[PDB]
Nucleic acid binder design. Structure first.
Lengths: 71, 138, 151, 66, 102, 60, 140, 177
RNA sequence: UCCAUUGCGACAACGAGCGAGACCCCGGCCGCGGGCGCCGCGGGACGGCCCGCGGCAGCGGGAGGACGGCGGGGCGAUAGCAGGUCUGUGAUGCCCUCAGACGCCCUGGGCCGCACGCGCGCUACACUGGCGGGGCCAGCCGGCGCCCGCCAGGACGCGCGGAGCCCCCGCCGUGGCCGGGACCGCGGGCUGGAACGCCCCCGCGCACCAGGAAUGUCUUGUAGGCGCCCGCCCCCACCGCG
């Protein structure tokens, strides 16, 4: 219902949580963690900047992201 | 060929970035506080919109050449629906002042030259478009 | 915009060996074909880029199906006028296919390719008879009518 | 499907009564060509003339078996 | 020589009365070099009126069309020869043949 | 229990009194291949294959 | 990684959850003239995520609100144009806009115009057809 | 299919629905504008992927937008590929068989058997109806939900809306057995 | 049997007619002749062929073919009915008001008044969406230039030109929120003799989170979704006809 737009110390916990996945959409993070999609969007822009993820499809509405190896 | 052989967005985005650094166009503040047209409720949220719109204006002028479009007709390609009323939505038009200013800046740069009736793209402008498309032609 | 005397006379000089017209929904795409660079040009732009992007495979449907052999060594100055988007994309594909059938010219492969063309998808060769409808009084639609108050 | 009307039907018999050899059992174009010989059989409109020929083709087909 | 291209614009509502006049223009001007007919795209005058004089009942509308036919020819010939052509061409009452000088 | 596949040989007619239901002669797909009548909703043509959970019930 | 929540801007609480330009559209519920922008001209970008805004930025926005004609904010924009007594362009926000609404309805009351009659008779002076408007409203 | 999903080993186990799901003619994308509705059973040989992309276009606000439906199938079929590691086309061709009831009730209420076409027709219809509801006022995308319904059904779950619908037609059918 | 009193078959009936159909209009396709402009005339498709099942009329299927089995309209029998219209007419019988007029003009107001109940609609209730820019696209059939103006529009010119949905990229992120635009406070314009009419701009952000008993319309370029044009018009379409 209510989400944090704004992760603080838990941004690394989120990074570990998103790295703890097989694939994800920024909307899937919004369901899995109580985060606005916009926060999740920005967070995953640098998740592929850290290079631990990859785009499968990119569309304006939705982009599917599969973590490169992360195994 | 060339500029039409290139996708529109990449060419419009790139040429726009070049205009700001080059000093071509130089946006007017009095027209930079306004919405593109009556059909827009909110004014552009893309920051330097004058530059990107100007890039597109010279991309249409290039294709037209013989047609010699005026300020109002080229504004029509930026027309949108007017929404938010109990009455059904109607397609309106973009603001001419933004486009008159853009054209006058291309005309002063001599990229555009006037014609009887509407203004058309001049060889200095024609080469600028041809060269930029040649810049990213793949 | 279609059914006009300027079909594709935009080309100045430029005599072309083969001509074909593919049409769908008030849209005429007329291609001027000559042996050229294996290049397909519609609306002055290359075949690779067209406006309905998820329909690009359709605009190039027999490039994969018939075989690039005929596609290599061919220049197509297609122009589409009329319709909206999908109407134009089905009409370019119809025009491109018929132009290549004419390009074989005398070997019976025009018959064999038409046999292949009717197999993967007919309409690559034949016209889509479905065209449009007429509004009639007593309804916003043609078939649809207005609401009855007292049954 | 399409049900032949009394004009498209009585005339067809009148054509097979007068002419026998000229029309053939499965020959629409021939049956349309015989029925189109001006005064010998006059049917205004191809649509009526084509419909007559189709019924003549069906009647001619019926008579050849028996 | 007072030689001018002479415009000939024909308007007939009746396609067959107008189409026969097109044959007439061609024959008389065969000698004076009449032009092949550039048929105007048909202009349809369309009026839709409710069939009911009193507006009651189911809505029934009358679709009424005046399908005027205009055909244009141009002749670069003598004014006396243009005049012979107007006398020579069949006179169909209710058919408008109009001449302008270019 | 486990459903038994069957195959229509012909569609005798339409029933239901509202239309929309059909009488089909079905032959079980395998083994003894019992040919018994069946009642089916939805569009059915000859040679279609249906799996009947009930199996024993017979249409008239 | 940084945020502040409700701002006490003009007797309102602006959530840090909002994207700032959309957030200040509600100032005490009444009187925004910024028209969803025109505060970029005073100072910061559209997506300052609301909470991020510093006290320094707040005073600059607050300054533009008191002096509207200073940052490209023209007389074509602004909440109030020639005032019936002031005769100057102005921007009225929060309690003040509603207070000035009372002042104009008092004017219509003294002037006893048709609009004044309808304003005390709870009727619509603008929406022409009142035969079939307020159903369930059950009002005179 | 979409230039990413092949069409070679994808078939269905059910022989009752063997002819009805078309798996040998999918076009490169599911557009193929055709008069499938015309003629009685020409709809059976329509590609299952163009039968699904047509089903999503329902409720008017969403009517007619085949392109917005096509990207919704490719987003769903891209999501399925990653999660299930098997061809996404197969999951739809498997789900259609699973979502299909084998018994319905018509007054003649009385138990009847659904024809192969109906088991396919309701099966695709059910797949989209649930996804449409499970994405109406929720943040989750219609495409993400479309992927789950399409997959849960294939493996077989009463969690899936299409099966929770199948299951009940067949419990109502067992009442009128 | 049919779409059909459309035909078959039986049969004191046998033949005809009118209505049905045919015809007319437009559409898809081929050809001919012309071409300020695609626009004149001819073909073509007939349940023809094939396989079943039928004495049969036809009843399913198969191709071939732009086109397939009544394509999308016009026209419309015999009778009707106290349907509607005397307020469309120099259509009209009767009472005919007829000059302090029920004639005919001018001004002002109403026809739009609103405790309410209903019919046709429109816009909604959003993430298949709103909000920004980037492409691009019609058809009925189609004018623009330039300058000033945020706009709406205005001045001065000439002979001429085109949608939205959709797509592409950002953004909001489930919050009655940037969903929704109802009401109301300034203004700026337009058209006219004159707003009360409309447009625009900055506020202001109502209900409504999918609708009870019921009730409507609909079979492929269909429903729906989306715009555009015209009708009537000083101004103005949530309407109608396209």
């Amino acid at each position: 219902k209510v989400d944090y737009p704004a992760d603080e110390a838990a941004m690394n916990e989120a990074l570990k949580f998103i790295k703890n996945s097989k694939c994800i959409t920024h909307t899937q993070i919004c369901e899995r963690l109580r985060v606005s999609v916009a926060l999740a969007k920005r967070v995953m822009r640098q998740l592929v900047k850290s290079g631990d993820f990859a785009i499968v499809s990119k569309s304006s509405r939705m982009t599917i992201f599969k973590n490169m190896t992360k195994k | 060929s060339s500029v039409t052989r290139v996708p529109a967005d990449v060419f419009i985005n790139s040429f726009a970035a070049h205009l700001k650094n080059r000093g071509i166009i130089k946006c007017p503040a009095f027209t930079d506080y306004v919405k593109t047209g009556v059909s827009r409720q909110y004014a552009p949220r893309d920051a330097d919109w004058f530059y990107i719109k100007a890039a597109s204006v010279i991309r249409h002028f290039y294709i037209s050449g013989s047609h010699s479009i005026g300020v109002a007709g080229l504004a029509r390609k930026y027309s949108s629906l007017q929404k938010g009323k109990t009455t059904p939505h109607h397609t309106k038009r973009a603001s001419c002042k933004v486009i008159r200013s853009i054209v006058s800046q291309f005309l002063g740069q001599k990229l555009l030259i006037a014609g009887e009736r509407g203004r058309h793209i001049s060889p200095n402008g024609r080469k600028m478009v041809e060269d930029f498309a040649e810049g990213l032609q793949k | 915009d279609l059914l006009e005397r300027n079909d594709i006379e935009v080309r100045e000089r430029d005599k072309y060996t083969v001509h074909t017209l593919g049409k769908k929904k008030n849209s005429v795409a007329v291609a001027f074909v000559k042996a050229g660079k294996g290049d397909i040009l519609v609306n002055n732009v290359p075949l690779a880029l067209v406006r309905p992007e998820i329909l690009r495979t359709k605009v190039s449907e027999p490039i994969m199906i018939l075989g690039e052999s005929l596609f290599k060594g061919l220049d197509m100055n297609i122009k589409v006028a009329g319709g909206g988007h999908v109407s134009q994309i089905y009409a370019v594909r119809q025009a491109i296919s018929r132009g290549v059938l004419a390009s074989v010219k005398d070997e019976a492969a025009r018959s064999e390719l038409r046999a292949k063309l009717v197999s993967y998808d007919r309409q690559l060769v034949v016209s889509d008879p479905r065209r449009c409808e007429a509004k009639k009084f007593g309804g916003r639609g043609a078939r649809a009518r207005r609401q009855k108050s007292y049954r | 499907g399409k049900v032949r009307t009394k004009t498209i039907k009585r005339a067809a018999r009148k054509i097979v009564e007068n002419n026998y050899e000229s029309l053939k059992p499965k020959d629409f174009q021939n049956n349309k060509a015989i029925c189109s010989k001006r005064n010998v059989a006059i049917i205004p409109s191809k649509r009526l003339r084509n419909k007559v020929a189709g019924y003549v083709t069906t009647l001619m087909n019926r008579v050849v078996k028996g | 020589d007072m030689h001018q291209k002479y415009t000939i614009i024909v308007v007939g509502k009746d396609l067959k009365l107008v189409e026969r006049y097109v044959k007439s223009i061609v024959k008389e001007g065969r000698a004076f070099g009449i032009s092949g007919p550039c048929r105007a795209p048909v202009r349809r005058l369309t009026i839709t009126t409710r069939k009911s004089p009193c507006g009651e009942g189911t809505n029934t509308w009358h679709r009424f069309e005046l399908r005027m036919y205009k055909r244009t020819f141009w002749v670069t010939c003598g004014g006396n020869d243009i005049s012979t052509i107007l006398s020579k061409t069949v006179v169909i009452p209710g058919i408008q043949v109009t001449v302008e000088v270019e | 229990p486990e459903p038994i596949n069957a195959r229509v040989i012909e569609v005798l007619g339409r029933t239901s009194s509202r239309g929309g239901i059909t009488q089909v002669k079905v032959e079980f797909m395998t083994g003894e291949k019992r040919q018994i009548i069946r009642n089916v909703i939805g569009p059915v043509r000859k040679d279609d294959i249906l799996v009947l959970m009930e199996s024993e019930r017979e249409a008239r | 990684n940084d945020y502040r929540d409700l701002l006490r801007m003009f007797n309102t609480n602006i959530q840090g959850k909002v994207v700032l330009e959309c957030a200040l559209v509600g100032i005490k519920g009444i009187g925004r003239r910024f028209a969803n922008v025109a505060l970029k001209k005073a100072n910061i970008d559209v997506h300052k995520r609301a909470g991020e805004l510093t006290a320094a930025e707040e005073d600059a926005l607050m300054k533009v609100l008191e002096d509207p004609l200073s940052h490209g904010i023209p007389a074509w924009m602004l909440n109030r144009n020639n005032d019936f007594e002031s005769g100057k362009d102005m921007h009225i926000l929060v309690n003040t806009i509603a207070s000035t609404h009372r002042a104009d309805l008092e004017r219509l009351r003294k002037t006893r115009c048709e609009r004044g009659v309808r304003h005390h008779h709870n009727l619509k002076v603008r929406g022409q057809h009142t035969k079939s408007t307020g159903r369930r409203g059950h009002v005179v | 299919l979409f230039n990413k999903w092949p069409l070679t080993d994808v078939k269905c186990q059910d022989e009752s629905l063997e002819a009805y799901i078309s798996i040998d003619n999918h076009s490169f994308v599911p557009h193929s504008a055709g008069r499938w509705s015309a003629k009685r059973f020409r709809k059976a040989k329509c590609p299952v992927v163009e039968r699904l992309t047509n089903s999503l276009m329902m409720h008017g606000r969403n009517s007619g937008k085949k392109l917005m439906a096509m990207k919704t199938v490719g987003e769903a079929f891209e999501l399925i590929n990653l999660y299930t590691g098997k061809n996404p086309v197969q999951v739809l061709v498997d789900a259609v068989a699973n979502s299909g009831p084998r018994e319905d009730s018509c007054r003649i209420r009385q138990s009847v058997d659904v024809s192969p076409l109906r088991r396919v027709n309701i099966g695709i219809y059910n797949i989209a109806t649930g996804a449409r509801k499970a994405a109406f006022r929720k943040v989750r995308p219609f495409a993400e939900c479309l992927a789950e319904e399409i997959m849960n059904a294939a493996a077989g779950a009463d969690k899936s809306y299409a099966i929770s619908q199948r299951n009940s037609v067949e419990r109502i059918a067992v009442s009128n057995r």
